[PDB]
């Protein structure tokens, strides 16, 4: 029958994420200077509650850079240790939480980085696809916590939302006034 690996395949699409990964964080880091500047539009004209909602989106976008960054690490470490991969059957003790967590960030990241889905598939064709399948929910339970939660598709809490518009009004100096009970709370 025979393996789908194709060691070759991995070693290209690794190098093609990491500078993906750092286009997409200059990209984003760029674009979210323009969307504080909007958010402080809405707060001179003083859409308050628009303003929480729409803020949640540079909130995620600042955690994304921060996780691409974690991605950018791992990626790098599987190119250094790349003989471990293509040279021996058994995955690497301290690779293990390199491999698992790319393919656990795939899916999450493909629709902006696509590579990073045939870096996935490959480590998948390596380790086999049941392997591949305890990663992408973290049964596994060695995928990164920081990472995760960089990328967790939670919404953040009213504390945050309260502290980033705090810091746009503050930064543009436009009137902002805080719910008073999540501070309170917090």
């Keep these: 029958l025979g393996s789908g690996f194709k060691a070759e395949r991995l070693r290209v699409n690794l190098r093609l994420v990491i500078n993906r990964l750092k286009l997409l964080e200059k990209k984003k880091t760029e674009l979210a200077q323009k969307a504080r500047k909007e958010i402080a539009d809405y707060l001179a004209a003083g859409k308050d509650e628009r303003a ?7 909130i995620r976008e600042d955690y994304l850079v921060e996780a691409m960054e974690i991605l950018e690490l791992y990626c790098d470490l599987l190119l250094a240790r790349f003989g471990l991969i293509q040279s021996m059957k058994e995955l690497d003790s301290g690779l293990a939480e390199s491999v698992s967590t790319l393919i656990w960030a795939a899916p999450r990241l493909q629709s902006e980085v696509a ?61 902002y006034e805080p719910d008073s009970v999540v501070m309170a709370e917090a």
């Design 52 to 58: 929480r909602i729409r803020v949640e989106h540079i």
């Design 115 to 175: 590579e990073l889905k045939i870096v996935a598939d490959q480590l998948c064709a390596k380790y086999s696809k049941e392997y591949g399948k305890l990663c992408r929910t973290n049964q596994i339970g060695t995928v990164n916590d920081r990472l995760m939660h960089k990328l967790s598709v939670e919404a953040p809490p009213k504390i945050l939302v309260e502290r980033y518009l705090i810091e746009i009004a503050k930064n543009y100096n436009v009137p």
